[PDB]
Amino acid sequence: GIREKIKLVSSAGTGHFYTTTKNKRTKPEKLELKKFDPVVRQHVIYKEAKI
Amino acid sequence: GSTRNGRDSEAKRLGVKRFGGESVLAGSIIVRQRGTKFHAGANVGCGRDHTLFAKADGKVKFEVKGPKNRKFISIEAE
Amino acid sequence: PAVEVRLDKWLWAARFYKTRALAREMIEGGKVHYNGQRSKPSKIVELNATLTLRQGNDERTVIVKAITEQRRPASEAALLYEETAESVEKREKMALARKLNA
RNA sequence: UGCCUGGCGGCCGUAGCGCGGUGGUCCCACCUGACCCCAUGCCGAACUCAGAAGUGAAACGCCGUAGCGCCGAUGGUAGUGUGGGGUCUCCCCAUGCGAGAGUAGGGAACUGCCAGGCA
RNA sequence: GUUUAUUAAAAACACAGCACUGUGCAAACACGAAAGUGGACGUAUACGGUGUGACGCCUGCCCGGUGCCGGAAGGUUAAUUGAUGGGGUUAGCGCAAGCGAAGCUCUUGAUCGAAGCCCCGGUAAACGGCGGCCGUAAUAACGGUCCUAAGGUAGCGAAAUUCCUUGUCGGGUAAGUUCCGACCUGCACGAAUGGCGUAAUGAUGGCCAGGCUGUCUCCACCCGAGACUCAGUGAAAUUGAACUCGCUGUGAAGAUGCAGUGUACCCGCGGCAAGACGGAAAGACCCCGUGAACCUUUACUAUAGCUUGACACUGAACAUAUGUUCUAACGUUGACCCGUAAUCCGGGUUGCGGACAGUGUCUGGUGGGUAGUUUGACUGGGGCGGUCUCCUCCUAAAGAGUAACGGAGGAGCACGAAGGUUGGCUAAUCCUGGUCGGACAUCAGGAGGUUAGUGCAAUGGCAUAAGCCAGCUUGACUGCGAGCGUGACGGCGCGAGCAGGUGCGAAAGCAGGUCAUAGUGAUCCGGUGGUUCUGAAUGGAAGGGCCAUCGCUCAACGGAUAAAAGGUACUCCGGGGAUAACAGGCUGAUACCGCCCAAGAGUUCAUAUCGACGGCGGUGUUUGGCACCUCGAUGUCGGCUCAUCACAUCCUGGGGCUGAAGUAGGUCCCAAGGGUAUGGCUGUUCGCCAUUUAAAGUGGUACGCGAGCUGG
RNA sequence: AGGACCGAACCGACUAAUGUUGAAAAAUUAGCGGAUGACUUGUGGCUGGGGGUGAAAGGCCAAUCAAACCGGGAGAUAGCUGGUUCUCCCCGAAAGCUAUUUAGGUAGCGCCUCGUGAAUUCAUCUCCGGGGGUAGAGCACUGUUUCGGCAAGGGGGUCAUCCCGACUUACCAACCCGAUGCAAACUGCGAAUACCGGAGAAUGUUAUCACGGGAGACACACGGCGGGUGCUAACGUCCGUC
RNA sequence: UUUUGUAUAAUGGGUCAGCGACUUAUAUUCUGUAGCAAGGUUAACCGAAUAGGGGAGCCGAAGGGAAACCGAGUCUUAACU
RNA sequence: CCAUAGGUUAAUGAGGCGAACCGGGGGAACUGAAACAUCUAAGUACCCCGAGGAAAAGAAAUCAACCGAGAUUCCCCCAG
RNA sequence: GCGGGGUGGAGCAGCCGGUAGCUCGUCGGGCAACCCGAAGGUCGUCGGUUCAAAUCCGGCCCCCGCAACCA
């Protein structure tokens, strides 16, 4: 629906990413979260990016 | 001659898959149900969809316990 | 999907004439002008398009972009028709000429 | 060993409400103070700490009492599996199972572990 | 005048006349890959196309849609040209990572680019259109008002047009659904898909009268050819086999063949056709086929033709890509000479056009002119309507599952908190008291105990809360998965536990999304990031692979194609009584006819005669239900002829009661022996009307009767 | 003079009857239209199939025309109809679920058959361990319904008179209480059956499960029982079990 | 024959005789049988050769993975109890 | 005007038929896809031209893979 | 038989869960034209859901576009 799919890009520089959804209208702020990254093996902070 | 009805959902095969006194391997689903009609007791886990599964081999057993007189499922170890 | 607007409908919304029938009669009589020339009622008003309208004794020329099918209160009509500065000056010139005639 | 009190349970209304009475040595409760450990989307009400002046008022426990809740026969009734039948939208018969409601009645719980005060 | 040779001769076609439009001649248009030919050995007073159809009076308003004509101010836009950017490769530089010149090469595509389209005007004897609503003199003149491009002028009008309809009134007739004349309430006339008249003409349609008559009441007789008999010759369709009766019932439901019963010696000949669902034609109507044909169009996809531009055939100067001039390519369906005995053809001279025209390749537009195709399924026949996937409840018969065009509601999401954890808290409703404040605001207490709440339908859950509040946080983690549920399969679902790492908690522990169940899309084809896994001689790269991930209202939701609407009565083929229309069959809701109780009408009295509010039956008679027989055939309405049966009786016959004085009635009971109209209108059954009669019965018999007649 | 008039030859075909296995695959008889013209006719030529011609009917094109005839692709295709030929022995269905441009076809499963392997694998009965929320029953709940008691409050308005205390109703009355019903989408109760599991004896030609070869079938009908729809109508239609 | 069901008044046959419908080629799986047996077997072709030669080939003995690669193991994952 | 075209004669060859095979110039639809357009049927049927007893092809501007083969055609595998 | 509508005196958005407004008609005031202010609905009627219906659902009445066709 209104929610648009986005990618959370690992900040480890390894190119791994997650996919989630959000709506731009209510929450224009960037999405940032600590998620596990398999290739580097460590909990690193992910920032959203365009899909 | 138009009717607004005629719509239904596929049945979900709920109910008690394993009844009392039946030997079940670990992890076997005992009852699938909507809501915790049967509650989790000894050696029984409650999955997210309120299904109850045996956490160890043994014999399933229904009983009534507690101030609410609710049904509880437990695996008598064997 | 833009909704087309008739010329007499626009005039009636702008309240220049009491009724759309009067607007049609005035247009058919040739008094009303679109882009400074005789125009039929079927013509379409467009944004940033001059309406060389002739009402009573004073001319008006508006190029408004806001076109409303619905008739509005006169406070809104002031916004409905733009009445550019040159048109204002010409209208006051016509008013002064009428005052001199009177 | 007997009485009473606190905690943890078994069981989940025969065990719960109501009404009356009773208890402070110990235990519990209320209670005194709170700058501080701690907390109020305000309040030491709750939570929390520091104590033991007073009391059993409230709560709590214990005893009694059917105004309720609750439990509940025997008999009949309803229903129904199998077979047979009728006047076949419903019944009946043999045999097996046999309710629900209602009636007589029961009923003011019983009980395990540990700790404490009294004899 | 012409026409469906062989069911349609006409209101149809044509017609002279009228108008619009194209065409300047190498005309337009047509046949033709082209050369050529018709147009025409014609030249706008001619030829082509289109519409109306002599003649008389006229042809009103509308240019928004579609088409046609015209325009340039602007935007979009093909082929072609290839600036800039990115990438691949490597002579080199670095120690390695990596950087990287030239060349070659993959890719994006700046600038140039005509028509068309968007846009602006004109055109209706171009295709076309000429509307709503409200009030107003019972109607609604008239006005108001919405919309449109603008709302029907003249004329005509229940008509070849009018459903209600046999419209209202008058003539004709005794009686006139037709006819003739007026009215206007034109469902739904209307001016060249022409309106209104009109003399004449019509194997034209409707009606009326004189005369005429076997059309008819009602048939009679006669003359001839068959039919019948004798002699000679000598077919046909059809045919499972027949020792080939009626009735009532039964039965794939309309029986010569079954059950019961009645009748019947065997066999011809002449006649009538009720039956053998009789013979003829694998139903023409209806449905089905992922059948066919031909036709239509703003269905899809192409394409002939028309049309635009680039390049080529294709050149030169001069002036400012445009213009002027030129001759040498090219054209000449101009003249003249020759091959030549020649209106073809070729060559030469000359003239006129002249780098235009025309043709080839490429390219945009237009393109039912032509071609291949599509145009779903369920369906108490088909069509129209509705539905097509997912979730909740009931039907669902106490495991699961379970259909209907059965009964009821929702979904195609939401959320970085509405998730995780830790700690804490408990609702609705009512009563009492309290400022505005009241029925319902917040405050206090009491009763009550989940009747509240759940992000969204319903069900099942929920106090240990899954409900409400706060602090910290990202477990809405990565890889696996013992076992199990559910599906034909694809798949969908639940899951303790293990490893790495994290959040909350002092710890025990919980966390792999949310109280659960809906919030979805296979495969293919591609896109993006990572990973040498592969790398068509080798080294790289392109592509492919693995992992993550993006693009379908593919909603006909297991999705046929990237891409698709209709007509057929001009029809056709394979099939079905698997499925409709007539008839039969089953049922009897409705229809008709009886009966029950008795409020009331009947001056009083319920029942002489009616009988409300309700109830119970009979027949199979109308309207309907089912689809059981027949679709390798069961002919349908009405009339004519001929009838047969039932009795729920129209007349005649007998009788009870009466609100029966008599006559004449009302009702009911018994009775089926006999009887039971002629006409006008209309296709009529029916029905209205006129005139009779004792009466002009109600029904069944394939709504009797077409191998008996007709055919409105 | 006349696309003039009446009317034979000649051309045509309006009405009726006959004929309809004819005299005739479109005629005969009696009537009928044109008959100096857009007439009719003899002989020869041209137009050839998505083509011709057509005073226009989809008419004609060799008795055939919404695309002729002949030969070929060709044995087109046909989820459709029909037919499928000797004998005996053993076994023996289905007309159901799922999906389908799918509904009269086909595919997987279900059912049948042949072979291989396998456990007391399977069926009945007795006993034992189970959950249920249907028949029935009930009205605490969700709804619905009748009567009565008190009566918050209100309606016609007022004694009181600011009120309280209550005054009769044209009166209406919420909740609560007492009594009586009703429910597929009500349930504080709740069977008989059926179903799952366990143990045991008897009987049964392994009757059960798995793998493989071969299918057929996916149009069902009636009757009993429980039901929806229908009218508790149908030899009606759609389910469950026998 | 088609059907839920036909004495059916549903379909076909007037009768007799003759003809008339699951075949043929190749390739794959299964069953039976026969040869050989961790081996089996040739095709074309040579050959007068139903012989003999011809062993080019196909099948399985080794699987896992997309693949490099590894191999009684492999793949998944950094690694698996 | 030379000349060319043109005309007459002469010598040589051709012309037409024939079953299949061969080469070349053109070239369908039915059909399968369970519809149909990309595709298939299929460069098949058919039409035309040409030649021979055979025709076509034919002596690497071919393959291969850092080792090598040595024109063309046909048969069997590679291989569904 | 299927869908739409039913809102001041008329025409109208809205509206479609969140306290009813605009033009004309009437009056009055500014000033034929034009500007300002005010009365003016109770949302066709009856019920249900909701904290609350102009709004959302069930039935009822009227009017509108359709179809009631092949035999």
UniProtKB/Swiss-Prot annotation, chain A:
PROSITE patterns: RIBOSOMAL_L33. Keywords: Methylation, Ribonucleoprotein, Ribosomal protein, RNA-binding, tRNA-binding. One of its GO terms (biological process) is ribosomal large subunit assembly. InterPro entries: Ribosomal_bL33, Ribosomal_bL33_CS, Ribosomal_bL33_sf, Ribosomal_zn-bd. The keyword Calcium does not apply. The keyword tRNA-binding applies. It comes from the Bacteria. One of its GO terms (molecular function) is structural constituent of ribosome. One of its GO terms (cellular component) is cytosol. Surface exposed on the 50S subunit. Belongs to the bacterial ribosomal protein bL33 family. Part of the 50S ribosomal subunit. Cross-links to the P and E site tRNAs. NCBIfam families: PRK00595.1, rpmG_bact. This is Large ribosomal subunit protein bL33. It comes from Escherichia coli (strain K12).
Curated annotation (Swiss-Prot), chain B:
Transmembrane segments: none annotated. It holds the Pfam family Ribosomal_L27. GO terms for molecular function: ribosome binding; rRNA binding; structural constituent of ribosome; tRNA binding. InterPro entries: Ribosomal_bL27 (IPR001684), Ribosomal_bL27_CS (IPR018261). One of its GO terms (biological process) is ribosomal large subunit assembly. Keywords: Ribonucleoprotein, Ribosomal protein, RNA-binding, rRNA-binding, tRNA-binding. Residues 1-13 are annotated as: Disordered. The keyword RNA-binding applies. Gene3D superfamilies: 2.40.50.100. SUPFAM superfamilies: Ribosomal L27 protein-like. GO terms for cellular component: cytoplasm; cytosolic large ribosomal subunit. NCBIfam families: L27. Part of the 50S ribosomal subunit. Cross-links to the 23S rRNA. Cross-links to the A and P site tRNAs. Belongs to the bacterial ribosomal protein bL27 family. PANTHER family: LARGE RIBOSOMAL SUBUNIT PROTEIN BL27M (PTHR15893:SF0), RIBOSOMAL PROTEIN L27 (PTHR15893). This is Large ribosomal subunit protein bL27. It comes from Escherichia coli (strain K12). The gene is rpmA.
Curated annotation (Swiss-Prot), chain C:
Disulfide bonds: none annotated. Keywords: DNA-binding, RNA-binding, Stress response. The keyword RNA-binding applies. Induction: By heat shock. Belongs to the HSP15 family. Involved in the recycling of free 50S ribosomal subunits that still carry a nascent chain. Binds RNA more specifically than DNA. Binds with very high affinity to the free 50S ribosomal subunit. Does not bind it when it is part of the 70S ribosome. This is Heat shock protein 15. The gene is hslR. The chain holds residues 5 to 106 of 133 of the full protein.
